[PDB]
Symmetry: none
Subunit: 105 residues, 4 copies
Amino acid sequence: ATMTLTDANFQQAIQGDGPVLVDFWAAWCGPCRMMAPVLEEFAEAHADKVTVAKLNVDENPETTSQFGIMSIPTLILFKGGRPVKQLIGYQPKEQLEAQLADVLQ
Amino acid sequence: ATMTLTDANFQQAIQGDGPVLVDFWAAWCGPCRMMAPVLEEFAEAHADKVTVAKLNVDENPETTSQFGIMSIPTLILFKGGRPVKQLIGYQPKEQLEAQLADVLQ
Amino acid sequence: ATMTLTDANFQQAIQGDGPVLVDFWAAWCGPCRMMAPVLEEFAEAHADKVTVAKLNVDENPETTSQFGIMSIPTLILFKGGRPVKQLIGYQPKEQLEAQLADVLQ
Amino acid sequence: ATMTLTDANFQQAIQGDGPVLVDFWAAWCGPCRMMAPVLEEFAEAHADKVTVAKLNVDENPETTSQFGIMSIPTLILFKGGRPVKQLIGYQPKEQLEAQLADVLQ
């Protein structure tokens, strides 16, 4: 729910002003469907600690290839406009919050 | 030469007699770019044993989802309009050949 | 009756003469959910000739990789501790019966 | 200096009796190839303080999974066999120097 990223708006949309959690997803991806509500809820619950961004790899090959994405879904946390943490994309709320403890504090 | 398939024509294209090796790939996928020339060479060497088809998952989510694809690339061998073997998509030509030894015999 | 296996007990479960039909599935996979009731009825009807186990791929990544599962649903029949047959895709009662006529002896 | 690491010798080398900078890469990864010359130069002016090693993710699945590598290039600095810093994405010389300095004395 917070932002839709594209190869065109990525560079700007992920600069300075606040941590951005990018979810690399695909329409055909099953786990991404299970993760969709988890991320929506996460975005709502920590809307002031971080911004959740969605990058549909189906339509955005440059960014996806640029980060050497290997599996869908994949999560990458950006701070100061730079990727600082990477996580497998399938994560229950508990595990997701535990690993992102720092930014949520 | 490889055969390009879409969600719209996939069903008719895999209707049996004459094995079809389907490569589920994406342009942003690194291993897929490594395999492109490999599969084209493979197709040229075994054209009268099997047809190599390519299904771009970025553009064809229906077929991809129908087969519960989880990672790309993925190779699925079809015989009789039915999927009979599933293979890791990123493999050297020599390993692929061993894996498909029966259809190549 | 469709006992559940995991990465922690899979190996010894199959490391036996005992014919075991393993159902590789996930909650997000429609055809997988379509086959759960069929398999439950199947396990009940042929309990004397085969034991039906379920392996959720999202929760058990080790087993999923070891057996190169790239497409779900997939059924793998183990005999003597080794996979002897794989069935890819939704299998209605009649197909399962026909395909597994062997173990059904 | 560019010692090659594998699933077999990684943990051992990481318990390296000194800091080790591991470069996670693949032959399909452009920014990774771009980073290769940069890392060699770094390994040079810091060969008394750190060893630079390479781990190909395509050929070494266990290490790749062990460290949750979802995006490459990725560098992980180990100090005492434990990961102490992780850098994601291309790092120009100036960045490598600034980010790893606290390990450069």
